[PDB]
Amino acid sequence: NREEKILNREIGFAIGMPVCEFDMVKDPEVQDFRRNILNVCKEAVDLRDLNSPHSRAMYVYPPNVESSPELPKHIYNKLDKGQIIVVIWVIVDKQKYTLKINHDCVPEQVIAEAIRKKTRSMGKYILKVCGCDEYFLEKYPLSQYKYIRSCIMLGRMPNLMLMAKESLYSQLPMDCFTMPSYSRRTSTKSLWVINSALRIKILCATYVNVNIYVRTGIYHGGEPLCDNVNTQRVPCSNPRWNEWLNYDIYIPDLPRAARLCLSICSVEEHCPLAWGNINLFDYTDTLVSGKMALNLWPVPDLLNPIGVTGSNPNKETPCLELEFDWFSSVVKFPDMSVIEEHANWSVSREAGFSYSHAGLSNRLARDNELRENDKEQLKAISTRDPLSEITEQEKDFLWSHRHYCVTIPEILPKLLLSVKWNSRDEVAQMYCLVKDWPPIKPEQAMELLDCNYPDPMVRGFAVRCLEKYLTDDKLSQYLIQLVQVLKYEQYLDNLLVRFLLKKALTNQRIGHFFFWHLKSEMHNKTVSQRFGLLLESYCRACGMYLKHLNRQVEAMEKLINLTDILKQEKKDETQKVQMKFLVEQMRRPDFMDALQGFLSPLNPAHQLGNLRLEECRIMSSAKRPLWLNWENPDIMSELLFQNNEIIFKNGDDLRQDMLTLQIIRIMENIWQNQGLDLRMLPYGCLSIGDCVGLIEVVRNSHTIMQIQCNSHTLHQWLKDKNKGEIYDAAIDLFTRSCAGYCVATFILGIGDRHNSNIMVKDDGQLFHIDFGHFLDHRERVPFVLTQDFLIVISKGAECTKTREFERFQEMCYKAYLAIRQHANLFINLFSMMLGSGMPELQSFDDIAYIRKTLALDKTEQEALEYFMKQMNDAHHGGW
Numbered sequence: 001n002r003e004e005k006i007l008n009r010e011i012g013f014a015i016g017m018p019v020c021e022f023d024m025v026k027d028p029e030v031q032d033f034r035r036n037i038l039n040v041c042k043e044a045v046d047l048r049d050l051n052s053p054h055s056r057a058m059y060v061y062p063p064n065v066e067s068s069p070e071l072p073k074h075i076y077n078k079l080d081k082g083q084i085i086v087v088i089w090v091i092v093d094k095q096k097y098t099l100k101i102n103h104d105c106v107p108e109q110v111i112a113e114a115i116r117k118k119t120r121s122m123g124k125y126i127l128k129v130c131g132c133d134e135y136f137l138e139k140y141p142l143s144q145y146k147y148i149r150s151c152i153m154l155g156r157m158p159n160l161m162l163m164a165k166e167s168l169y170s171q172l173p174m175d176c177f178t179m180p181s182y183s184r185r186t187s188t189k190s191l192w193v194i195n196s197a198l199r200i201k202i203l204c205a206t207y208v209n210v211n212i213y214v215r216t217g218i219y220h221g222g223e224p225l226c227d228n229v230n231t232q233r234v235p236c237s238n239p240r241w242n243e244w245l246n247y248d249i250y251i252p253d254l255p256r257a258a259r260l261c262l263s264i265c266s267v268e269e270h271c272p273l274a275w276g277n278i279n280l281f282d283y284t285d286t287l288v289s290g291k292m293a294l295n296l297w298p299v300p301d302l303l304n305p306i307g308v309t310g311s312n313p314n315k316e317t318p319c320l321e322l323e324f325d326w327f328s329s330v331v332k333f334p335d336m337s338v339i340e341e342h343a344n345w346s347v348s349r350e351a352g353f354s355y356s357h358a359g360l361s362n363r364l365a366r367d368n369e370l371r372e373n374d375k376e377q378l379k380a381i382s383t384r385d386p387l388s389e390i391t392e393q394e395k396d397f398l399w400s401h402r403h404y405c406v407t408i409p410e411i412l413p414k415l416l417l418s419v420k421w422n423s424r425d426e427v428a429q430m431y432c433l434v435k436d437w438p439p440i441k442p443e444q445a446m447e448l449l450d451c452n453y454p455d456p457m458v459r460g461f462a463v464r465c466l467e468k469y470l471t472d473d474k475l476s477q478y479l480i481q482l483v484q485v486l487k488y489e490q491y492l493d494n495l496l497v498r499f500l501l502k503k504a505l506t507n508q509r510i511g512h513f514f515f516w517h518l519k520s521e522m523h524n525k526t527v528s529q530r531f532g533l534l535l536e537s538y539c540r541a542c543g544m545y546l547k548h549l550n551r552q553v554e555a556m557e558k559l560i561n562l563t564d565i566l567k568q569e570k571k572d573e574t575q576k577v578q579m580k581f582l583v584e585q586m587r588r589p590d591f592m593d594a595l596q597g598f599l600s601p602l603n604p605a606h607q608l609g610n611l612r613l614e615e616c617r618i619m620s621s622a623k624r625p626l627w628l629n630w631e632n633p634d635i636m637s638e639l640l641f642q643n644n645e646i647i648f649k650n651g652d653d654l655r656q657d658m659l660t661l662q663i664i665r666i667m668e669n670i671w672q673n674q675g676l677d678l679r680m681l682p683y684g685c686l687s688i689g690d691c692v693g694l695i696e697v698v699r700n701s702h703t704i705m706q707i708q709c710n711s712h713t714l715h716q717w718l719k720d721k722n723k724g725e726i727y728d729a730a731i732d733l734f735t736r737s738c739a740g741y742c743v744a745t746f747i748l749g750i751g752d753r754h755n756s757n758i759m760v761k762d763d764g765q766l767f768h769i770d771f772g773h774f775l776d777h778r779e780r781v782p783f784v785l786t787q788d789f790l791i792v793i794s795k796g797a798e799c800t801k802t803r804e805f806e807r808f809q810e811m812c813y814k815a816y817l818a819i820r821q822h823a824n825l826f827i828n829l830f831s832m833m834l835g836s837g838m839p840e841l842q843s844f845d846d847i848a849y850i851r852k853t854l855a856l857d858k859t860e861q862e863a864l865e866y867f868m869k870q871m872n873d874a875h876h877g878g879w
């Protein structure tokens with residue numbers, strides 16, 4: 001209890017709300033979640049204690065490693081006959097030892113050769129990256145570590161520090177995981193034996209304050225299971241309906257994930273005033289019964305089935321009182337034994353159907369009447385993108401051939417949307433198909449966790465595909481989306497949240513961003529309880545890292561508080577006076593300690609040492625962000641970077657930039673693996689709160705305006721920065737990077753480019769900043785190549801009619817079609833992000849912008865001609 005109280009304060013500080021507020025929640029789902037989730041906490045801690053010293057180090061310092069050991073061919077060509085030159089430092093004074101060695105060498109082999117060269121100068125060691133807290137604790141090939149592959153790709157010398165194993169292990173403390181205090185804690189009839197249609201009683205509304213009627217519907221995801229039913233019209237002075245609304249569904253046919261969606265509307269031009277959604281079955285599989293009160297949400301269509309389920313935690317809001325049916329017994333959803341037997345009964349009955357019986361329905365087909373054309377038709381349908389319309393004929397067709405669909409596993413999402421979810425006979429059969437369904441790729445499985453797929457059997461299958469096949473690399477890459485799709489889950493306790501929590505608690509690189517993605521949305525009352533309770537479970541079992549997270553939370557909090565004062569109190573004051581106030585307030589003993597000596601939330605391998613106050617400044621950009629500079633206190637910081645530079649911005653939504661930078665990284669990965677070296681720059685960006693976040697500074701980079709402050713000025717600047725033999729590499733890097741950003745920005749519909757949001761590095765690497773908006777915010781061309789860009793592309797020249805420009809065009813075409821081939825991934829990544837509150841990504845029609853820019857209905861050659869035409873019209877010729 002004494003140690004628990006201190007831990008409760010630590011967790012309360014981390015999550016931004018006290019633990020006691022969870023204790024006072026009456027809802028038994030909340031209290032069951034808190035108790036039952038501790039299984040995952042226990043399991044994770046055991047894996048860390050299994051092989052205790054090394055396995056604890058593996059948790060804290062996991063290998064930053066690529067998914068595949070196999071190297072792309074053009075990256076292998078950068079090596080000297082498949083060998084890499086590596087520098088290994090030994091602190092005795094620092095002593096370097098340059099080794100020329102095979103790229104696929106194991107760290108232990110690399111350590112041995114360093115000792116041999118040290119012996120020429122006359123398993124107890126581990127390799128560390130010089131300048132940051134990144135270690136090579138696992139037996140991978142050296143080239144698979146992301147630091148080395150980055151070094152090979154960029155043509156940089158890898159600098160590693162030889163360190164004693166016991167020096168690392170002694171730093172890692174043993175955290176004893178303790179279970180909390182809350183650990184120690186008519187008839188029943190089946191759904192299918194209730195011969196009755198669905199009825200729901202709407203009683204009355206309270207807190208209906210204005211200067212009406214209740215619309216309702218029953219939904220499986222975004223799909224209606226029957227017609228919407230309205231109450232009779234009533235004046236807002238007395239909202240008391242007391243009507244039994246009758247729905248066209250048999251109760252036995254209600255799917256597991258069935259939801260009552262409702263709204264109070266005003267009356268023609270109808271308009272929603274407030275909305276609310278309810279699960280028709282609770283977390284214990286029990287059908288909702290008796291009286292209930294639902295506090296509604298403000299409108300951001302008359303109903304909102306995409307919106308989150310459950311009551312508004314704000315109780316000073318419109319509150320509809322509801323009553324459900326009574327059957328003199330506790331109604332529960334049937335077990336899988338009952339479902340399997342019913343499916344088996346249906347399959348055998350259908351297999352007995354005659355020619356004429358099967359002829360009654362297009363959803364029924366005979367077993368020995370599957371021709372070669374219809375098999376290839378199913379294959380053709382499966383290749384189509386997620387936003388492509390599946391007609392009712394195709395749905396009937398897909399379902400009738402569902403047993404053949406098992407042989408083409410990737411078609412599952414199409415088949416699932418073809419199912420009649422208001423028919424227990426079909427759903428029961430679909431459950432048995434999903435149960436034994438073969439594994440699909442993690443990227444394909446991710447689609448089945450978005451808002452179109454609410455069924456727990458379907459989502460369980462998706463989670464199992466991730467458990468079996470999703471690497472830690474790709475989990476880290478897609479964590480943003482996987483956190484978002486938790487919002488679509490019916491219940492607090494589910495297979496997805498258990499999978500993500502276990503990975504967060506067995507991989508501290510994952511756990512770090514897991515914490516911050518959840519923490520960043522704790523202001524949002526749509527997800528505050530779920531994320532708060534999930535964060536509690538994480539903090540209770542993450543070990544020593546809670547204390548390091550609390551350093552980061554306090555550092556951010558003091559930066560939030562400081563920037564709030566400057567944009568409220570000292571709004572209209574000069575830069576000199578604001579800076580004097582800033583430096584004085586930061587130099588306060590409590591502030592100064594809080595704002596230095598912690599890990600970067602952008603990358604927890606980076607230690608932020610002492611602040612360089614003289615290097616810090618208030619920027620002239622929108623919302624006046626802070627430019628912050630810390631010393632890197634790493635002993636070999638000079639070999640990576642001496643100073644860590646971060647932009648702290650308080651005022652603007654940084655989630656759009658975060659998503660774009662992630663997508664840019666994924667686009668770059670596709671191009672690099674395909675074998676076209678178009679270097680992008682997806683710099684770090686992290687939303688930490690409500691319109692608050694961090695941005696990674698790229699060193700030695702300048703905006704186009706800063707270069708200029710003639711058309712040849714930009715090309716002349718790169719000449720001066722890259723004189724002699726380096727010049728050709730700089731122009732090449734510029735052309736290749738410019739080509740990637742041209743293609744990326746057009747596809748995504750990024751905000752209009754200009755001289756202040758395009759940047760160029762000294763070496764020639766072009767990139768974009770401040771994305772802000774994407775998609776349909778007819779298809780625009782954000783990055784118009786002015787003559788400045790074309791002149792440098794053409795090496796100073798009629799820059800349109802040159803071989804350098806024709807080369808540049810071919811890079812753009814190859815890059816365009818490469819992304820077209822991976823269109824489903826990007827559509828799915830955007831679809832998983834619809835639950836987020838980004839205003840430009842609210843519906844599937846917003847995502848349909850990518851369908852247009854990638855020209856998916858059109859052919860591959862027609863897609864190039866479309867892309868060429870957009871570039872031609874934007875630039876007024878050339879393409």
Ligand SMILES: CC(C)n1ncnc1-c1cn2c(n1)-c1ccc(O[C@@H](C)C(N)=O)cc1OCC2
Nearest residue numbers: 621625647683695696697698701702703769770
């Ligand atoms: C406008 C800004 C606050 N912003 N808004 C949304 N994204 C950015 C944003 C993103 N980056 C930057 N800014 C950035 C700026 C300045 C900079 O160097 C200084 C010396 C300069 N050129 O004056 C280096 C930089 O690194 C690239 C990443």
